[PDB]
Amino acid sequence: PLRDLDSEHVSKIVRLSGIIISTSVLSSRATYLSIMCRNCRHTTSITINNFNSITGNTVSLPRSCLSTIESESSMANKKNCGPDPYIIIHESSKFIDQQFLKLQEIPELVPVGEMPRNLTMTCDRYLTNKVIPGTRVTIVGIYSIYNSKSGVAIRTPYIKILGIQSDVETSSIWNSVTMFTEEEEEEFLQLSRNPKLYEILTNSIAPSIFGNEDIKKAIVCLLMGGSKKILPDGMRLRGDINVLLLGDPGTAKSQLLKFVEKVSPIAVYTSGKGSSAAGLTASVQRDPMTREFYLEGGAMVLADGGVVCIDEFDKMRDEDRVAIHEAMEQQTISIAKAGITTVLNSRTSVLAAANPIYGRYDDL
Amino acid sequence: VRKDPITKEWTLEGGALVLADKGVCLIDEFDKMNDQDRTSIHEAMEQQSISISKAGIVTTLQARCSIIAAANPNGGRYNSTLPLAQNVSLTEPILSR
Amino acid sequence: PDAVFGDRVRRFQEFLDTFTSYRDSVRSIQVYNSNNAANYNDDLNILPHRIIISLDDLREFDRSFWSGILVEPAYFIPPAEKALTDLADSMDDVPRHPWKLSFKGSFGAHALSPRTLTAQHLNKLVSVEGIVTKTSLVRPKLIRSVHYAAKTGRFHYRDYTDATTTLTTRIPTPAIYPTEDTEGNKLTTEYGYSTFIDHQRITVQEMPEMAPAGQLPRSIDVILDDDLVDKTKPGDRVNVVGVFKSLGAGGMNQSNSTLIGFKTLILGNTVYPLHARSTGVAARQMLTDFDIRNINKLSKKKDIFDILSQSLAPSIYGHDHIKKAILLMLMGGVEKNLENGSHLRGDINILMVGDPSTAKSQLLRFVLNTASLAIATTGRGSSGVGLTAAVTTDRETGERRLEAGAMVLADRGVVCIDEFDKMTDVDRVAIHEVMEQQTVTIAKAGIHTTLNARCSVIAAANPVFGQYDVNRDPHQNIALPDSLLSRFDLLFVVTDDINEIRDRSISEHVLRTHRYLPPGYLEGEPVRERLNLSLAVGGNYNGTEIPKLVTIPFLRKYVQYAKERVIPQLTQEAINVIVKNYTDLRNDDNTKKSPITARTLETLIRLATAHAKVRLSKTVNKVDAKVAANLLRFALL
Amino acid sequence: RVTLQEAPGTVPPGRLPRHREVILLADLVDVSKPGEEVEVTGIYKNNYDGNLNAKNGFPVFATIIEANSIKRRVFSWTEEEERE
Amino acid sequence: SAALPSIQLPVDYNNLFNEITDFLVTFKQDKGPKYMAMLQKVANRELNSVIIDLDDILQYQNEKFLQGTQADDLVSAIQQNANHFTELFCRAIDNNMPLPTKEIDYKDDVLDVILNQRRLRNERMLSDRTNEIRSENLMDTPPSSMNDALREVVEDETELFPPNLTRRYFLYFKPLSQNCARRYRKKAISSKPLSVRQIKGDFLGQLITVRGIITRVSDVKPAVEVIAYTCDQCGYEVFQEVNSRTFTPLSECTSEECSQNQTKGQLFMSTRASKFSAFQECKIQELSQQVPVGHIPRSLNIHVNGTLVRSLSPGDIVDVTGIFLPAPYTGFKALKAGLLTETYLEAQFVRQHKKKFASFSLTSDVEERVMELITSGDVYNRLAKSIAPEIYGNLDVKKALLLLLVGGVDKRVGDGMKIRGDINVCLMGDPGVAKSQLLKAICKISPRGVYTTGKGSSGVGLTAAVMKDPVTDEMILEGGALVLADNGICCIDEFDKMDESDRTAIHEVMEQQTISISKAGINTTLNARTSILAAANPLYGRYNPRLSPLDNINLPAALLSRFDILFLMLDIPSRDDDEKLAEHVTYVHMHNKQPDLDFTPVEPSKMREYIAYAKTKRPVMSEAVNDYVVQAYIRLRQDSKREMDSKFSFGQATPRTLLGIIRLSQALAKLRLADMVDIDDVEEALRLVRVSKESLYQE
Amino acid sequence: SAALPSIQLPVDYNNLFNEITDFLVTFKQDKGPKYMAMLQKVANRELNSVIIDLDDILQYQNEKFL
């Protein structure tokens, strides 16, 4: 665990799990750099194969010119080039990417009145841009030290990442895979010729739910969706199907929504008023450290190409009402803030659930 | 997702529902709750999880927690002539859970 | 002198001699500058000294030199620039600033994103598409300072360079600003003889359309020089072609000792403001001579108004008068600016109210897709500061700046409002000034200014009861203030009346509309969505070059040519008709959906003027007045 | 580094609870969770800082307690506990 | 050496300086030369600024070209490098400076007596050194050559006060007019107004003109140009120049006596002996006509030094001509690439598009225009109908708008209470009666007008806001629209859709002409002498005769009583009036001009100067007209009592109605340019009050 | 870089090396080639110095010209 990291693990390989707060921008570190003296014009190359250092230059430019110590020329033309006389020739130097990640212990197992502790991690080369913030990862890495300029000799620990394992992979457009192997192709083709295919796909939809066969047929049709059309005049016809299930409490509509969230390749289950801290539709908020407009989140946009299961669909804000309307026909959300103007994709099928007023339904 | 004003460090607080995972959450004064806390309780009893999309963090936290809540009836007294839903400001889906 | 430099200069001489388009582009720039200078001498604008180079033609000419520009631009771009300068000076002997280069074409793996840019693309020519978020103030940078010595009466100069102005790193020699000559005499700075080059910093972020939906966005910095400044504003979608370069030492000296890393930015060579949907860049299309002749051939037909209108949205059945109104809105009338400063509208505003599922949102999306500068808003989603303007704080100067809302960004364009009836009251008061005075006046804490919001507003609304009732008067049906209705030139009540033959026409039209494939697509293959970005310069399916129905891409060119070319003027034969119909409409006994105020009169004028743009006529005739009148009558009765 | 205040039960009426700062060494780390009454034996000494305190204008030092021992003033069942 | 190489420029500063001297002596516009009368007034301490006209220099070069002699292009040399030509002119002016006719006295400025003492002290140094060198008698021997050599050695060995420490005048550049350039085939970049976008880095060092609105004006502060120090050890005064925003003070004495001596004296600052400039920093923003499509307006910094201070105020359309000069870089050190520089405009000339009413002076050229407008007759109707010539009808509305522009007489009593003289006019009417066009016209005509939409300005956007000025580094109060319209007209469009905060602020403004703020930042009162023109709709957006006029004018009785004139602008359909309205509007749309050719509408500048001259008047009332006003007031109150129960009530008669009648009568007397209020003025005032409400509603 | 620039020289060492190789294997003054016999003597440790005759190279160039 993150709390059992002691001073016995320093400069050792440790395997440790948690969740990721933030992924920093990619900094450019130097692997091979060519240098040339200011007035001596001595050309030299420094190759670097160690990039684990943080807050400090473990390999820097030489303090003095190397022409005198090498004695490369027999002519050997008191002359001093000066302190730090080398200039990096950038169009002949080679660079790699480096990233700062921030890892917290999981908030499920934290002391009740205490701050969750966190560590900074550094990754490089092909370990960068492999994980998004919020994913749960176990990471193998060197538990190392940097000095930051609270105790006469106190050092800040960090992790040099040697490997990242993703326990669970989030579902999104960019994380979706379109590659298929020939065995899965053959299995799907063999499945498609079954004459009772409709019956078995309806039976596979929530086998623990008694009845509601027409609802399960509707759910299969929603999962497939229809053909989308783009016409020469530019207006588009949508293929996604939006199904409302409204009825008495205790009729397993929420369980149908949950099963649709489980079976869909991309899905999000939210309430009519959103989530605890995840909005519905689309939220545009200012960036934390640079104060720039960006898309904060939202159920209808994270579930692009998927299904949003809106439980308690009748209780909903007026913002979310108009955004849901525009997303159900147009499959787009139009954002016109004071600084940002965009029309962003919301290609999502909506499966909504509702409980009518006065408790049970009234036939009158 | 809260940034300390002095430390300038972003931390992810799961809240009392995620923090009570595999345990019990005790919510005193369940009636005069605000809207965001009601939504958090609704999600924590429906999905037994809490989904966050804040500050670049989009994830779900397990909230498999039992809830022992305490509430006062409307007007300061229970009226036995009216049924339960009219004595409490809680709506039907949260009362049914 | 370097041998490989001269070899590459000669190779670019051969490339420029092979393709004469760059040669006579240089010719056209030089003769434009020469005639402007001669007109200044006898009785203005100066084109920059840079040439757009196609990378595909270079790839066809020399693969090695093309790969040299793409992969090692520091060793290949300066020889090409010197070659272009020598070519320009070869023909400039008969009639001083060195010539620059810019690049277009396919970049292959170098067409990247601010997220996709990593350190493997450093010291390479990259084409990055994105959105401009921050634009620094255009600051002059001293290149050569000129000084005067009064004791000896002589002029000196000193040149200044930095690592940004060159692609190839040289020895940094910091020459201080001379306040004293070699003999010890005081120097006076001669401003006006010193040279200053405009410098700009912009920040290019990944587009919100192509960004991951929950992650923080990635951004890059781009440096621009004199001819490339002020080509962007914040909120634009852009394509920046430039060299991705690292500068300084990333803490590897003793004085620096920090982990900013090596600072990375883009030396901008080319800036293309891309047009995107619901953005601030207006779509512009190059009008060839053949297309101009085609437009003039359309304009001579008597049926011209009914082809361009019916060719708007052929996949929507009916709503023909709405198509006519949308076409006239796209033409946009003529704006009058009186001599005392008073202002008269030209823009046409359309409101559609009626039953649900009646092609209102689809028509709004069509106007968003086909107009040059349409911006889409919804009712609750954007607010009074969202549509008009807001105030923010600058980090550098520390003073408050403005952020432009939907109306200001859509100046000389269209604002497409969906769910118009769900606006807040303060938003409605904000709309009142925009729809008539065509301006936004903001008086905040310390900021008092007027922004130009000359917009055409097309809006979709629902009745308060969810359905339109014929027996009930429209005042309670629309339930909107009469000032707002007077702002809108044409109000259309769309009713979903149920008729058997009409429903059969609806069904046949829709089912024939749902049976379409694009060319080059198989029967079962799903259609792929490609995001539409267009460069800004300066039910029958088989519509190909005006057989019966006009294509949308040619409709765009017709609209652009009509707006740019013809500015029609009224004459007495149209004025008599307009006056007679306005007098009849003011004193008619028939109940009407919209009240008849003075605005309606100018509405007629604008509508008539709009029809004169359809015919490409410099004169507004009687037929234009009559078609304006009977388009207004259908909307009113 | 652990901040310790006087227990609120034992403070005299008008006085605020004083606080000191305690440094826990290698084996004593993560022993006392916050919110519990604990008793620390340790050496009371001065924390040295550069140029003292400019705000006070007096040569005033801050004090720390280097903990020698920590004593607390558990859902573990043994082999007898499960039989019980 | 080649480390500081040299280039050859066409400019030569010797022949241009000789041309400057010849121009200063021999220019005569057509007592004696212009710039020797001007320097005579400067020397007599009757003039503080020397304004050099580029029209004068162009004309001078023109008669030199006509005489046949060769003259350099001094105007283009100024327009390219004006910063050097400032001290070139200053040196030439100090070369031939007339002696003052009037002796110095005790009613004279402190800087002037310091300058006189400096000149006398320099003369004493020259005389004493001449006497010592002559008494030395080195050679004991050509008297004129000996005197010349002795003068040259005296002037090279003595340290005098420099000329810069002896200027009592500030020198500025007036740009050449466009018309004078049109006469003489000259094309100058200085004359043409640029926007902030059009001012690029290629204009640095040039005399250029920028057109725009002033958004911010700093307070006048003393910016030190040269610092004076006294040394007790040697008695010298040591002056160090300052050309930057910050300086380091001098500690040890740098005079020759202390430089040679082993013991160094200590310098003490002497603020009376040091040279300061009145310094202001202003922000200029380009007009909405100059902002391109889809862009946000930007700003430029204007530096005002010397006499030209307090000539720029926020809310002014202005052409500012000045030298475009660079400044050291302000910003982050990481974001700079090379020698980045900030920019500013050292102001030389200011031209106001709208001239202030308090700045009006009865000059010679104004009088013939005013007398021409008087002799044309019927100036009340002529100025009324020419306010918005392309808005048909509404003659009485435009008449009361003219009275709004002129206003009445502000009254002060020795008891201390004040009665305002400004008139407040409300236009409430049906949509499409062109009342927003009237608001735009009125506060585009008025020099200090502000147009405001009801929800476009919040509570903080009307009264006040506390915020920091960094140039003077102090926490100042910046007012809203009611401060920018002080001694002007505040146009408040869409009056009925406002919040209660702005209603209360305007409620206090229309009576006490102040705003009182008692908040967590400030406890103050601030003057706002605005005349308020409001535009509004009825309750349902349309007037309906079923309810009372008070009912559908959803307006409280107090704020109704504060308005002197409220116009019901009803859109009543008719066959005849709609014909004429349509003909008017179609003519304006076709010809871009007013229909009626029977009258010439009066130009906005002509109306502005006539209204200023009318506002100079302070008419009074005699006993007979007071008695008529009293009788009219009595009958008005009895009529309002009688009609109170009926549905035709517009309210209840008020002493504020009496004061409004008095103010309208005083404004009408001001339009006649009379010191007396006549019976016909009160006749017109009562007629206007009656036609504002009763006439259109009864029809 | 520009600190060590380049010039173009008429000498080309690749074709000159090929000419040297051909001259060594094909020169026959008038057993077999001359310098091949010399290199056989060197390889047999009977000759220690190889003398390159420039009249031989001139004759080789002239016969290739012929």
Ligand SMILES: Nc1ncnc2c1ncn2[C@@H]1O[C@H](COP(=O)(O)OP(=O)(O)OP(O)(O)=S)[C@@H](O)[C@H]1O
């Ligand atoms: N027909 C059914 N077959 C199987 N399980 C069922 C059935 N009806 C209800 N259940 C179960 O009983 C519970 C009912 O919960 P849900 O009905 O899903 O809640 P809901 O009432 O539909 O949603 P509300 O109206 O917001 S309380 C679940 O645990 C279901 O698994």
Ligand SMILES: Nc1ncnc2c1ncn2[C@@H]1O[C@H](COP(=O)(O)OP(=O)(O)OP(O)(O)=S)[C@@H](O)[C@H]1O
């Ligand atoms: N009497 C008139 N003469 C000339 N043009 C007029 C007249 N009345 C209205 N108009 C025209 O009709 C329009 C009126 O616009 P506005 O100035 O907004 O009128 P309004 O009374 O302010 O409307 P609101 O904002 O609902 S009170 C303009 O285009 C005017 O040119």
Ligand SMILES: Nc1ncnc2c1ncn2[C@@H]1O[C@H](COP(=O)(O)OP(=O)(O)O)[C@@H](O)[C@H]1O
């Ligand atoms: N006249 C019409 N012709 C063809 N399709 C129509 C027509 N009216 C409505 N539709 C269809 O109905 C769907 C509903 O969208 P829309 O009618 O725009 O919603 P709303 O009317 O609520 O704005 C659209 O997908 C559109 O294809």
Ligand SMILES: [Mg+2]
């Ligand atoms: Mg449920």
Ligand SMILES: [Mg+2]
């Ligand atoms: Mg719709």
Ligand SMILES: [Mg+2]
């Ligand atoms: Mg108006």
Ligand SMILES: [Zn+2]
């Ligand atoms: Zn060296």
Ligand SMILES: [Zn+2]
């Ligand atoms: Zn001294």
